[PDB]
């Protein structure tokens, strides 16, 4: 089912390139309508890049959730 | 850039998961205004289904080819 591969492709992605910043934790994410937002850093270090004023990391890729558009 | 982290995403992608039935010739693929379709099968794969009459492997998986929706 097409729908599957997409999923796992997600959920791999996800999994194997943790947190720009830290290299550790995984990325924060949002779901947005249809996509997923994965967002460039974990929480932790995105609030911790504003209070250090740093902006280099900041950033999101976003995937359709489906196989189909 | 987070355009370049799906370019190189996507690039990866259709390089490690060949044909799903020859399993060794990479995959068929359209641009499709903003999205990349990733057909299943090669196009000699898919001719061949056609004419063998299996629609077991026929799809695709879309993918946007840009970082924001
Ligand atoms: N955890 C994070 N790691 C990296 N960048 C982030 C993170 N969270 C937010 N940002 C980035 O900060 C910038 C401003 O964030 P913002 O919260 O506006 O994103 P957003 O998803 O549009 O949220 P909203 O819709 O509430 O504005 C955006 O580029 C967003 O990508
Ligand atoms: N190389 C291929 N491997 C697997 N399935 C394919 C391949 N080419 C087409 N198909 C599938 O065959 C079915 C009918 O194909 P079709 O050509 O209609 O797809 P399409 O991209 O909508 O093309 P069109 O817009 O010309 O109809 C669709 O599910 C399509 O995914
Ligand atoms: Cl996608
Ligand atoms: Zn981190
Ligand atoms: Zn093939």
Redesign the interface.
């Known amino acids: 089912d097409?729908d599957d591969?997409?999923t796992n492709?997600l959920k791999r992605?996800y999994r194997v390139r943790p947190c720009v910043k830290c290299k550790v934790a995984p990325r924060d994410w949002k779901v947005?309508n249809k996509?997923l937002r994965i967002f460039?850093m974990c929480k932790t270090c995105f609030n911790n890049s504003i209070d250090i004023g740093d902006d280099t990391y900041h950033?999101?890729?976003?995937?359709?959730m489906?196989?189909?558009?």
Chains 1, 2 share one sequence.
């Open positions: 097409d591969k997409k492709w992605i947005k996509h460039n950033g999101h890729v976003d995937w359709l489906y196989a189909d558009s």
